[PDB]
Design a protein around this ligand. Structure first.
Ligand SMILES: CO[C@H]1[C@H](O)[C@@H](O)[C@@H](O[C@H]2[C@H](O[C@@H]3CO[C@@H](O)[C@H](O)[C@H]3O)OC[C@@H](O)[C@@H]2O)O[C@@H]1C(=O)O
Ligand SMILES: CO[C@H]1[C@H](O)[C@@H](O)[C@@H](O[C@H]2[C@H](O[C@@H]3CO[C@@H](O)[C@H](O)[C@H]3O)OC[C@@H](O)[C@@H]2O)O[C@@H]1C(=O)O
Lengths: 671, 671
């Protein structure tokens, strides 16, 4: 009913197989059961072998050994260096007897990730004769956030309906949930919130006895795949379902209500992860976010639960007339002052940028500014402002730019990745979360190639140091095979896609210029006079938001001195973010040599030609990809080309109508 | 539970009463029963008298005689000139004996309208000692179109939920429907379509046995008040509920299906009015609208039913790049060529303007262009683009401008009103329809003063020659009393409201500039790059749609020579419609002496000050209006003032940003 995505386990030819007679499973836990089944599935499908599962090594059999450090009958130096619970070592026995592969994890979860790594090597056709691998994830929390609603809809979902809910109830078919867990575990994802951060009427009841049995059934599946389950909660629950007159976090009964709620949840789900919170709320009663988050943290504390508090807070009622108020400054001004006031099990979840997942946004100043408060970054896998899976947009390159951004919080070498992996400030709980891009569609992600974004998110979550090139390579090979043309072509498409999409959408980092509401397609003035604080200020002479300290909102001062100075200066501010930081004349000359207005025309005309090239390159792969997927993607690429033409012309015409400056190259701009 | 609107029948003082002992009802029909009950209600409430209802005149009693020409025991000359079925005569007996008032109608409906006229005179405090009145409606069809959905919502409804439906069923409480019928009948409305022209899933079933009993129950109520019931239909019904493979109007079985459907409906509702149609459809099968409308007309013909075919047809997928395509020309180019091909019981329903109920639009060229096809005009009482009942907007003055527009179809004296009343071309069926502005709100229309629009629609439908001044006077007196200050103040507010709203919204007839979707509030470029064909083409030098023959779309040629020439010339084109017909520089000098850009600034700054005056004048009436209604309206007036400020600033800033020309008077324009 649906695709296996990157876990194809395609049958190998007669010259690429392995000889194994047994799988030695040293443990019988639920996770080990799933681990063994996955190994059996992979070996059967790829190698056409069915090794017997045993609990003790056969001295003369070729085997794959699965176990933890305590199960070892010696313990070599390599695995001895393992300190992370989810870490593992994979090594081939150096002796000259039977062939033995040892997958040693610090804990059961480690064995799971180790087996998926082993299977990845097999799918990639790597030589496993002399393996010596040690892997430990950099981020403690590698999470997925679902924006699924219980009526089946998914907020900002472009890949079909929810696979969890339908008709305000849980789906009765859990097989797809198991396969989803397999996909998530294959890339190391260890945490998931199953419901929309915008908690509506029915969803508010997920923390009650009426739905907890179903939530537990789902959590049971995820647990076997090393994934902790979380629920997004309605801060007003005490009122809506608690029967209390207030939701004030300082009200004695409200505090008690949440403690009892936590206790109730843990009776159903002993290892419940905690709550994801989008915040009647704290401010409603004059309380700050520390007071609001700490109350929930205290309820979960005795049970080891975590409170994931989203920092996506700003004035959703800003006056477009007031150029002194800057939405981009909101998150930092709200949370920076609260550093050191949060309980230890509270993690502030901050979007990669200070605005709202635009094609390009500078890094949120909050990263590196709160040494005493756990932080985790939230990225959006679903392409809300990046093509909505109609346009191709491999998000990994962008995420790496964010992760590798040096905040200089503690001098050079204070990259965002070091902030969220917890090494820079010694955070007890930290990591990264991604807004799911899946749905009921057979190909899971709407656009077949968007499967690469989910896979890629997991890879970066595990190790931010992985290159975009190798992640793309891994995904393409596992999903489409090793034909050099197929690999090179699809890898190029993925690696080039983000820049291509940015080229014909919003210019030089100013963002937006999208249709209000659904957010798909060009509409330069869409939110220009709205109350959302998302303005470009384009007029007949220039464009851009002055965020400088010298003459603007002073947003640049939120960064540490090194980056603040870079953006503050009109001369040093990078072209790609120029309009986010400075208001400049259309004739302003960029580092590229292009005037701002000509840059707009250039990238929009040229971006469409690049999109046409994406389609052309794909068409050249006909015959090397199964017809179904070939046409599924071709269909989307054609949709992309046609819509790109709309983006190009709408933006070019809008700016020609305002600037009065013609295209240097005389290309077609409709009057 | 709800207000009586203009049928207050307020108790008179001791010096303004009438002496009547009997009501002589010569007939016992359902309509006569309602007529008598209404007279009893009015006299009891206003005069505190309860005359006995009899069937024969008492030679010595003061009486009110109700009957038709055949019931007369002589028949005087005046009533002898009555030719219209709904006409009536009201006259006081000239003898010196008992006081007698004769209300003589051509038919029962005539007696109903005559009684409501008599009651109107009493509410207005007119001297009825020597009455000699003769009235005949100008328009045969005086209809109301409901955009109500069966789930309770009302498309473009700003006065609450449907009073007809809820939960995909009919409401069980019909008392409000009776009071609504009373209101409609009081102003002569004789036809109504109860469901949205956009017929959805459940609504498509209104023409089936499952809902017909309920439809009939509603029709029964309206019948007693002289109102014919109509249903909007889904042209694809044969497929959706008929089980047929097509909806092609030329398919033999489709034609038969509709005939059987008509027969079925008439078994439940013997005097069913017919179908209102918004058109799978005719074009889907390569058929024209004559073929499509005639098929339905043939089904209803044997039963005397009518087909009301909406001419709101255009390319809802127009390319904004193509300046040769003009949505304004669509209706005429589509229907003009079909003149003479429609069945006699088909009436083409055309909006007052060629676009879509904007604050100001020139008259639809179709009026006066189809001598051989019945036509009726559709106006919108619900304020979709005129304030949505948040802003005050008495629509009567605008409708009179349309009705009095001389098309010169047959030389001078070919006003739109003569086209739709059927006198110019001898149309068998014609008239006017208005999109209802009512909802479940206690005050029926959301804005208390919007009650004047429904009342006013009925008055104009009855006699387009009535002045806006007298209609406003009638409504105010009946609804708020005769205090000279109250009357003068509210009348001024109503009469000035439309111009005030236009002043701060779209300029010089170009229209739109509203938020997409809900259509409320400023957004200059809202639909500027959309596929709806609603563009203003504003750039850094000028604004406007070139609809001239010389250099534009050639739309002016759709009018007859006299009007075509007026609009074609930049020098003679009226200021109020300039931007709808010409694209001009911001510096273009208007007949008023204002440059186009300064006119924009002037009306927007000044319109807000005028709105503040509306509120000020209302506040001065405190103490002379019951507190509930005083505050209900004050609340709305304050909302209007605050939103007007937004309209003013958004438009002024947009044009300053594009034109670069400052306000002549140095008023505040946000950069
Ligand atoms: C699940 O929450 C997220 C939103 O989907 C997302 O677009 C974003 O918020 C947008 C905003 O979205 C509107 C939110 O209110 C709704 O009633 C409306 O339908 C949406 O269109 O659109 C304007 C933009 O400036 C905001 O950033 O943020 C969400 C989040 O909570 O991260
Ligand atoms: C009941 O029909 C009418 C519409 O409510 C009204 O606004 C108008 O059509 C508008 C158009 O409305 C959209 C119609 O499609 C819907 O899916 C969408 O939600 C509405 O916003 O908005 C653009 C404007 O150019 C059109 O004129 O006409 C209606 C009618 O049938 O008279």
């Amino acid at each position: 009913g649906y695709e296996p995505c990157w876990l194809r386990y395609e049958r190998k030819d007669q010259y690429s197989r392995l000889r194994f007679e047994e799988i030695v499973a040293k443990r019988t836990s639920p996770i080990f059961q799933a681990v063994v089944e996955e190994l059996q599935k992979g070996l059967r499908s790829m190698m056409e072998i069915e090794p017997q599962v045993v609990q003790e090594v056969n001295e003369t059999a070729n085997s794959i050994w699965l176990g933890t450090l305590e199960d070892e009958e010696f313990e070599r130096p390599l695995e001895g260096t393992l300190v992370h619970p989810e870490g593992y070592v994979i090594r081939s026995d150096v002796d000259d007897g039977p062939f033995r592969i040892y997958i040693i994890g610090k804990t059961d979860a480690g064995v799971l990730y180790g087996v998926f790594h082993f299977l990845r090597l097999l799918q990639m056709g790597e030589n496993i004769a002399q393996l010596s691998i040690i892997e430990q994830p950099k981020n403690r929390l590698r999470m997925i956030n679902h924006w699924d609603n219980m009526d089946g809809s998914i907020e900002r979902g472009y890949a079909g309906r929810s696979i969890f809910f339908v008709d305000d109830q849980f789906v009765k078919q859990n097989q797809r949930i198991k396969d989803y867990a397999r996909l998530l575990a294959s890339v190391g994802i260890n945490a998931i919130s199953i419901n929309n951060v915008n908690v509506h009427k029915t969803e508010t009841k997920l923390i009650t006895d009426h739905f907890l049995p179903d939530v537990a059934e789902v959590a049971d599946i995820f647990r076997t795949y090393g994934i902790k389950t979380f629920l997004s909660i309605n801060y007003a629950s005490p009122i809506e379902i608690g029967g209390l007159p207030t939701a004030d976090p300082l009200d004695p009964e409200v505090r008690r209500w949440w403690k009892e709620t936590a206790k109730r949840i843990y009776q159903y789900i002993p290892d419940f992860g905690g709550f994801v919170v989008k915040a009647p709320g704290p401010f409603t009663y004059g309380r700050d976010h520390a007071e609001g988050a700490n109350m929930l943290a205290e309820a979960l504390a005795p049970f080891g639960g975590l409170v994931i508090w989203r920092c996506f807070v700003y004035n959703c009622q800003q006056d477009w007339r007031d150029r002194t108020t800057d939405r981009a400054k909101a998150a930092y001004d709200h949370f920076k002052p609260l550093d050191g006031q949060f309980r230890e099990n509270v993690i502030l979840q901050i979007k990669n940028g200070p605005m709202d997942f635009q094609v390009r946004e500078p890094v949120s100043p909050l990263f590196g500014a709160m040494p005493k408060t756990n932080q985790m970054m939230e990225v959006q896998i679903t392409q809300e402002y990046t093509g909505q899976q109609k346009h191709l947009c491999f998000l990994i390159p962008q995420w790496k730019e964010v992760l590798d951004f040096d905040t200089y919080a503690k001098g050079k070498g204070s990259e965002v990745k070091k902030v969220i992996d917890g090494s820079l400030f010694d955070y007890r709980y930290s990591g990264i979360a991604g807004v799911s891009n899946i749905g009921s569609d057979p190909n899971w992600t709407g656009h077949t190639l968007a499967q690469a974004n989910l896979y890629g998110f997991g890879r970066l979550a595990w190790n931010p140091d992985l290159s975009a090139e190798e992640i793309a390579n891994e995904w393409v090979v596992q999903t489409f095979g090793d034909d050099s043309q197929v690999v090179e072509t699809i890898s190029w498409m993925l690696l080039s896609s983000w820049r291509i999409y940015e080229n014909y959408t919003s210019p030089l980092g100013v963002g937006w210029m999208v249709n209000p509401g659904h957010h798909y397609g060009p509409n330069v003035d869409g939110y220009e006079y709205s109350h959302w604080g998302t303005y470009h200020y384009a007029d007949r002479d220039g464009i851009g938001v002055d965020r400088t300290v010298a003459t603007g909102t002073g947003y640049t001062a939120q960064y540490f001195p090194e980056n603040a100075a870079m953006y503050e200066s009109l001369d040093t501010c990078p072209d790609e973010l120029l309009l986010f930081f400075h208001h400049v004349p259309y004739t302003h000359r960029l580092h590229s040599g292009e005037t701002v207005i000509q840059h707009i025309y250039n990238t929009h005309f040229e971006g469409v030609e690049q999109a046409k090239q994406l389609r052309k390159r794909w068409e050249q792969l006909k015959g090397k990809i199964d017809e179904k997927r070939y046409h599924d993607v071709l269909e989307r690429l054609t949709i992309q080309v046609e819509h790109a033409k709309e983006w190009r012309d709408v933006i070019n015409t809008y700016f020609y109508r305002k600037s009065g400056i013609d295209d240097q190259y005389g290309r077609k701009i409709y009057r």
